[model samples]
Target chain A: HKARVEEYMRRALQATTEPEKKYWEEEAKKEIEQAMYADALINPIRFTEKAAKYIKTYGFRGQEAYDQVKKEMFEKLYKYFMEKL
Target chain B: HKARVEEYMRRALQATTEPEKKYWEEEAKKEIEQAMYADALINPIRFTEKAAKYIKTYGFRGQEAYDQVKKEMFEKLYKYFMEKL
Candidate 1:
């Protein structure tokens, strides 16, 4: 659910309109709360949702930035999870 | 590119028919070869492509299975990449 939460949070950060930012932020918090309870990963992302993430993330940076930041973040996330587990 | 290649390879593994299995496998290998040259991660997954992987992976198991295996695999992948880098 952290992934889902962050996705919504990302939406909030990237929101063009004003109202939507708050909406998605609330959604992200809700997802965060759900994750606090050990939530499931059954949400089948809609094509539009998937496309939006794909587009925005890629649009924000080139392959170079993606390869660097995302990879580093992913590695750090892994280490954190492994340690906790 | 590894992800895309593995996706195609997975398709090959999960293929029900005869010809398609071979086709996707070759595609996987091709993608693998592309990755050999430090390939970019700009391949926006088509809805069909994403759906197929999503369905096949999820359809094979329940939410519990997904939450466990994918998380583990993702963590391990991060570790491997971090070490190599």
Candidate 2:
């Protein structure tokens, strides 16, 4: 399910000193951005690879860009979920 | 008194399609950013002229850049306000 896990993963990546979390979060953002909202669910391994590429381009600064896109998508998904409910 | 009233003025100026609101919002953000958090209370005219100057440089996007800067200041103010409260 699409959720805040992605949100916090981004936060942890930027703020954490740990290599894994930093690595993981950057990967997650790349996967999400490149995927272009085609997939709602996250695959950890795929996200990791995407994070590596993302770090090469832009190091995670904060939740700004990730949160910006997520907010728009979350609204759409929320409407879809509510209609089903 | 410092309050979120300024916060909403910032939002309203962006959301309202009215010319005055848009004009005022951009002016206010510009003034505040230029003021460099030097003043706690806003003079409406100052905010307006600042906003006008801002649009010439950077258009008001939303509660974003304004909100981001406000957030940092608010937190600092919070700690100070709490000690007095």
Candidate 3:
């Protein structure tokens, strides 16, 4: 989902018009929020609504900037899950 | 691997010579067959040696014609796997 979110943003950034790009950017955020909500629901055993943190962190950037956000989110989640589990 | 296979084929089509494109096409078939073989072996829990029919049927085509082959092989696999699995 993060890859897909960033892919859409990169595509949106390439849009010919400002309004067209903004539309896709907004759609990307909506889709990311949807994925976060869905993933949280899938992890009913150990997690809560906090999965939204992942969307805000990783899905905020275009594909060219995705690695940084993905790395940070992975570290944060790995530490949290490891320390708690 | 199928997507990669087609990606290679499309790239090969843009190659300069017949031999060059043919080389990539052959390579694509080899990789696709390899994937089919691995999928078959992993299904020893249910399936038999007859699964080789899939690669023989679909994995032979060029990128432009893959959808037809893919449809036929999928139908055949659906029947075979449903019967066995």
Candidate 4:
């Protein structure tokens, strides 16, 4: 089920282009980013309320962080959340 | 614009495995085929009821035709619909 829905999303992901993504407003981009980020690992993702409380503190590298670094942080975050949960 | 959305779909096409498709009911497969077929040409597609009325008459090659042959029929059908409409 997860793979099926994820595949559906993955197709939609391919249908979009970088320029279109750049055209969105800041908040909209972040929201899309959130959606893509969650889907990136392609496993069902859940966060504990306990996990939620410390997420920013644990993972956010500050406003100066580069995009890739931030993404890797969340990638690891998702991994740990999956394995340790 | 169409290219962007089509690209998004292309990535999604790459994400899915074929085995999952084998599990779906016939109707669902057909609907998915319709969507994928529309996306194939990657131009904006519009068909008039006039065209709709004649589509079966114009393109349906009887129930015995192969899938790819039928797809080519629709492919040409779409090209003509775009150019003729």
Candidate 5:
């Protein structure tokens, strides 16, 4: 949700008028809070387990691959947690 | 490049024939060594500064965004390092 909001805000910066940008920026801020609240509810153990699976299967090669696995794991765990929340 | 090669290997696992899977799997192994060599040349301080910029700009909302920023920073840093390598 935070990423989604950031993307919207990034695009909003390109909006033609100040009002248009302000509108989306506010929406983005609201989403940030929503994401914060949602994130607090996620299970760390479950998230760790999911991440371990990827790391075990792929075997971390370097910074880029390690970061990519972390991103993939977070997205999957976040989506799952959000659905239950 | 490691991520690109892993993606290929993942898809190759679903390939119809054993030979096709073997081909991509071997390619992935070669890339693993290539990535290891390339990664050794990356400067830690540069990577840290690049990551700090994202964290400063985005304020680290949660796991998803934190991991995302890390991934983005790494891709940028890795590409820059690769060019100089």
Candidate 6:
């Protein structure tokens, strides 16, 4: 699947000039790092609040159950999308 | 950010009955887990080959450099969207 994406990128960029290609390649890396740093800073508080609200509204008894439910939800979504794709 | 999404989810689901609310809450959790699991399985090889092709095409000398570039790209994209948001 990674290779699939890579292949997609390759084909998508195939028509570009060498300089353009290099520019994008470098650009992509920079964006990745920034997102990583930003998310690292942002995710903890965001998730903490989110989980609290999720349990408050949905009646999960604790963080553990909330976490489990979140995991299970993601699994279902992934399977749903996988099939759709 | 996570809390933002959670709040959005809350408002979005506000009209649901108790059973409906519970259904979607569970559904969301399953989807989240699925995506996490899917991405874990999918990301490494995708990035590895992406890094390889990137280096090959863009003439980066090493995987380390390629990784750096990818990180930068993602960071840039993140910031770009953050600003837009």
User: How many residue pairs clash in model 3?
Assistant: 0
Across residues A1-80, which tens digit of lDDT does each residue of candidate 1 receive?
54675687788889898899979866754443333222112221232134344335443222333334344544554454
| Residue pairs whose backbone atoms clash in candidate 1 | none
Candidate DockQ values, in order, are 0.03, 0.01, 0.01, 0.01, 0.01, 0.02
B1-85: candidate 6 lDDT, tens digit per residue: 2343365357548845777676655544444333333443444224434545544533322344445434543454445435522
Where does model 1 exceed 4 Å of error? A38-85, B1-85
Query: What ranges in model 5 sit over 4 Å off?
Result: A40-85, B1-85
What's the C-alpha lDDT at position B83 in model 1? 47
Docking band of candidate 3: incorrect
lDDT of 5 by residue, B1-85 (tens): 5466658767797899989987876665445433332322343233323444444433332223335434543454344334422
Chain B TM-score against the true chain B, candidate 1: 0.39
Q: Output the worst ten-in-a-row residue range by lDDT, candidate 5 chain A.
A: A36-45
* Location of the lowest summed lDDT over 10 successive residues in candidate 6 chain A: A31-40
Looking at model 3, the pairs that clash are none
Tens-digit lDDT track of model 2 for B11-78:
67567577767666655555545443332233222432344443444445423434544454434433
Clash totals in order: 0, 4, 0, 10, 0, 38
Please tell me which predicted candidate would have the highest lDDT against the true structure: 3
- In the range B33-83, model 1's lDDT, one tens digit per residue, is 333212112221132134344435344222333344345544554454444
Please tell me which predicted candidate would have the highest TM-score against the true structure.
Answer: 3
Predicted candidate 3 versus true structure: per-residue lDDT over A1-85, tens digit per residue: 6677678888897899989898877667656545443443333212233444553565333332333333433344334324422
True contacts kept of each: 0.00, 0.00, 0.00, 0.00, 0.00, 0.00
CA displacement after TM-score superposition, residue B73 of candidate 3 (Å): 20
- Backbone clashes in model 4, listed as residue pairs: A10-B12, A11-B12, A14-B7, A14-B8, A14-B9, A14-B11, A15-B7, A15-B8, A15-B9, A16-B8
